Structure formats: C-alpha cells, structure tokens
Amino acid sequence: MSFKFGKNSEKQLATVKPELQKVARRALELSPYDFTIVQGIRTVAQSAQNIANGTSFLKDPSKSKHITGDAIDFAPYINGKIDWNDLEAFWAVKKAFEQAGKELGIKLRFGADWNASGDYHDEIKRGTYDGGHVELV
Ligand SMILES: [Zn+2]
C-alpha cells in the first residue's frame, strides 16, 4: 500500500515536457487507492529500437502519445497489489485524475466521450486500459 514512483517511474515523469506529471503525483494521494506508474516518456532506446522489427524506412513508433510527452500510463494499486482485473477500483482511481486536473489546472482527460459518440470502442466492458492512458487535452 501507499505505492510510489520508483527510480524508473520518478524519472519517466521527471522527463515529461508538460506538467501532467503533477496531477499524477497528487492523484496518488487524492485518490482512494494508490497507483503505480507504468510508462511516462519514451527514451532514446524505445522509439529508436522500435525499428528493430525490420522495416527501417517506416521508422516512426508513434502508436501512442508518449512521443510528444503529452501523455502517460499508470496502474490502479489496491490491497498492496496491482488491480488489473478489479476495474471497479479503476473508477475511483481514474476519477481522481480528472478531478485533480480541474483543481490543479493541469490538462487531463480520458477517452470516454470519444466512444460516447456512438458505441463503446474503448471496450470499457472488457476491462481494458484503452481509456486508462491519460493525455493532455
Ligand atoms: Zn499508453
């Protein structure tokens, strides 16, 4: 319990361009259940070695927003352990990210409205981290 950004996590966020990391740190406390950082910024080995597969001409590993450092990925911590199956808590945890961004002013928003347009493309019923990824809006 009371998880905190390790040496790798603290760095990932410490390498972010914007101040989105702020909401993350505060959220860890504000939110009911702690959370562990998974990814924050892309090093010179990630997007660089991303072309290790084969296609070097199509070198452009921008599948996410981490490239622009305007987004990060985290995991909802519960019972002193990672809760990837307990999406229930994910609601109380993520809710802190959106609530923390409004008070801190930091740009924070998830992909919950994008799917509202028609159907659930994020697959919130499946329990995926589709919308989990937080980015600046
Ligand atoms: Zn991500």
Curated annotation (Swiss-Prot):
GO molecular function terms noted in the UniProt entry: metal ion binding; peptidase activity
Keywords, ordered alphabetically: Antimicrobial, Bacteriolytic enzyme, Cell wall biogenesis/degradation, Cytolysis, Early protein, Host cell lysis by virus, Hydrolase, Metal-binding, Viral release from host cell, Zinc
GO biological process, one term: defense response to bacterium
Listed EC numbers: 3.4.24.-
Recorded effect of pH on activity: Optimum pH is 8.5.
InterPro entries: Hedgehog_sig/DD-Pept_Zn-bd_sf
Binding site for Zn(2+): 66, 73, 133
Cofactor: Zn(2+)
Inducers of expression: Expressed in the early phase of the viral replicative cycle.
Keyword check for Coiled coil: no
Reported function: Endolysin with L-alanyl-D-glutamate peptidase activity that degrades host peptidoglycans and participates with the holin in the sequential events which lead to the programmed host cell lysis releasing the mature viral particles. Once the holin has permeabilized the host cell membrane, the endolysin can reach the periplasm and break down the peptidoglycan layer by hydrolyzing the link between L-alanine and D-glutamate residues.
Family as reported in the entry's similarity comment: Belongs to the peptidase M15C family.
Descriptive protein name: L-alanyl-D-glutamate peptidase
Organism per entry: Escherichia phage T5 (Enterobacteria phage T5)
